[PDB]
């Protein structure tokens, strides 16, 4: 199950905010559950795969692009491309959303919602889910912060060790060389003395 909560301003009442809860199991195409709440009354409904397919075919538009637009609208993934407006009457239970551009409206979609007898349960479930996400995100962020600290510390330590290594390496060459010189010179003295003794004969 995947869930997304969004804030929509219904065009019947401008100041008050309304909340849209959209849930889908595997992918949005298969159908989704939509619940609209406003703090005192809620409406629940579902849209099945056959319904979305009929909507797309009746729009004579590619299914992929229609799904993209639907996600951009209901899941609030809209950018500066355009604007959408939502409509809902409390007596008909006929929700419908359109995309507005240049004084031209596209009835992007419509649903036939219904009342739910008990709003307390749905409101409480919503708040509970919000809090759960807050907690999970906080914990994961804390753990990632700790990991970042560890990474910084170890990177600094390794850089220090590398500095030591580079400082020592180039220097060590001459320290190696000088005693090669010493041993070679010692054997040199030995050979010269031996030759002098031999010539003394």
């Amino acid at each position: 199950m995947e869930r997304k909560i969004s804030r929509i301003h219904l065009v019947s009442e401008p100041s008050i905010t309304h909340f849209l809860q959209v849930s889908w199991e595997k992918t949005l195409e298969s159908g989704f559950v939509i619940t609209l709440t406003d703090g005192h009354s809620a409406w629940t409904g579902t849209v099945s795969e056959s319904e979305i397919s009929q909507e797309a075919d009746d729009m004579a538009m590619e299914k992929g692009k229609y799904v993209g637009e639907l996600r951009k609208a209901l899941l609030s993934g809209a950018g500066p491309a355009d604007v959408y407006t939502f409509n809902f009457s409390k007596e008909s239970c006929y929700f419908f959303f359109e995309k507005n551009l240049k004084d031209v409206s596209f009835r992007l979609g419509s649903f036939n919602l219904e009342k739910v007898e008990n709003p307390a349960e749905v409101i409480r479930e919503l708040i509970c889910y919000c809090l759960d996400t807050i907690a999970e995100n906080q914990a994961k962020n804390e753990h990632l912060q700790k990991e970042n600290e560890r990474l910084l510390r170890d990177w600094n330590d390794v850089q220090g060790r590398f500095e030591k290594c580079v400082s020592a390496k180039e220097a060590l060459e001459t320290d190696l060389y000088k005693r090669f010189i010493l041993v070679l010179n010692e054997k040199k003295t030995k050979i010269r003395s031996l030759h002098n003794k031999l010539l003394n004969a």
Binding site: D154, D157, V158, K164, D175, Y177, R179, L184
Partner: protein, 139 residues
Amino acid sequence: NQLKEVFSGIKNSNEQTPEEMASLIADLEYRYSWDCSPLSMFRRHTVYLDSYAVINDLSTKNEGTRLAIKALELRFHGAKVVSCLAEGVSHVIIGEDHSRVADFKAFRRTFKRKFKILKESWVTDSIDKCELQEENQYL
């Protein structure tokens, strides 16, 4: 300068094998007491790292820990890093995890020649001293 010139003059030579190089290095060092240098003092020692979740398992490498940098530093210094825990190993290094210490002790008892168990802090400190710190404090 003259030694440098003569070294430059010769072209190349690659007729030896790494084992022969190690043996010759050791022989020259012992004959002429090389060990006073800040490094090359890990040549006479073979070092094993517990980088494998399973002892003597090359397919369970645990790369991505400070143990890797420790082992690389050991390799730099002059230690003969050994991937397999042979009976000839002289040092075995362990990190913060002491889960398998009993296994290491059992293997040490099994082997004819015993190898001291050493912690990473031993080398992490001995680098500064550039000398073989007493293992008793780090046993």
